[PDB]
From a paper:
The resulting protein, designated DiB-RM, performs better than its parental variant both in vitro (except for the dissociation constant) and as a tag for protein-PAINT with higher brightness, localization precision, and apparent photostability. We speculate that the observed decrease in affinity to the ligand is caused by introducing two aromatic amino acids in the protein’s binding pocket (76F and 89Y). While the presence of these amino acids is most likely responsible for the observed increased brightness of the DiB-RM:M739 complex compared to the parental DiB1:M739 through the better protein:ligand interface packing, in the absence of the ligand these bulky amino acids might partially hinder the entrance of the ligand in the binding pocket. Crystallization analysis of DiB-RM in the apo form in different conditions further confirmed the already known high flexibility of the E/F lipocalin loop that was not properly addressed during our computational redesign. (C) The side and the top views on the overlay of the DiB1 complex (shown in yellow) with the DiB-RM apo structure (shown in light gray). The side chains of the amino acids in the positions that differ between DiB1 and DiB-RM as well as M739 are shown as sticks. Interestingly, in both cases, the 50 top-scored structures contained a mixture of different ligand positions one of which was matching the chromophore position in DiB1 while the other was very close to our original docked pose. This observation together with our inability to obtain the DiB-RM:M739 co-crystal structure might indicate that we have stabilized an alternative binding site for the ligand by the introduced mutations but have not destroyed the other one. As a result, the ligand in DiB-RM might have multiple possible binding positions. This can also explain the larger apparent dissociation constant of this new complex. Rigidifying of this loop through shortening or designed interactions can provide better stabilization of the ligand in the binding pocket.
Residue numbers in the entry: 20 to 177
The structure:
């Protein structure tokens, strides 16, 4: 089931959706065809009339010589105080989106998909401290993700 969280993963359960809105830089990702080779990736989150979120993915594609966007819609699968969502880019075809770690300042987030082949480190800044990087890798490995799969995404100052 590609719209539920991975078995045996803790999801953030005191989620304040309003503080999560705005722009997040992608620090690291497990690669798949949608993202592979994209640089300087951000995700931008905004509230919709219908209680879902707009998710605008932006990345630089060196082979095409262009910036490209993916326009999606995210909805909470349960209460909006549990950071368990599902995202679609076309039609009723959803993937799981789960915030599994978040600092009290809503400045750094570990986000996974519906299984352990999907994981992202995200930051309000394009670079993170070695201390924040270490905590992210510790949380991910404790939840059973193979962090050797990370691609460290090209960002200004990386």
């Amino acid at each position: 089931s590609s719209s539920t969280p991975p078995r045996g993963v803790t999801v953030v359960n005191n989620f304040d959706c309003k503080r999560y809105l705005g722009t997040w830089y992608e620090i690291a990702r497990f690669d798949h065809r949608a993202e592979r080779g994209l640089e300087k990736v951000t995700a931008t989150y905004s509230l919709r009339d219908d209680g879902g979120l707009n998710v605008i993915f932006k990345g630089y594609n060196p082979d095409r010589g262009m910036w490209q966007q993916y326009v999606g819609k995210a909805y909470f699968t349960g209460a909006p105080t549990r950071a368990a969502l599902k995202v679609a880019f076309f039609g009723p075809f959803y993937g799981g989106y789960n915030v599994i770690a978040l600092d009290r300042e809503y400045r750094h987030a570990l986000v996974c998909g519906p299984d352990r082949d999907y994981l992202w480190i995200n930051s309000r800044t394009p670079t993170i401290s070695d201390e924040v990087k270490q905590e992210m890798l510790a949380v991910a490995t404790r939840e059973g993700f193979d962090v050797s799969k990370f691609i460290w995404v090209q960002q200004p100052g990386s």
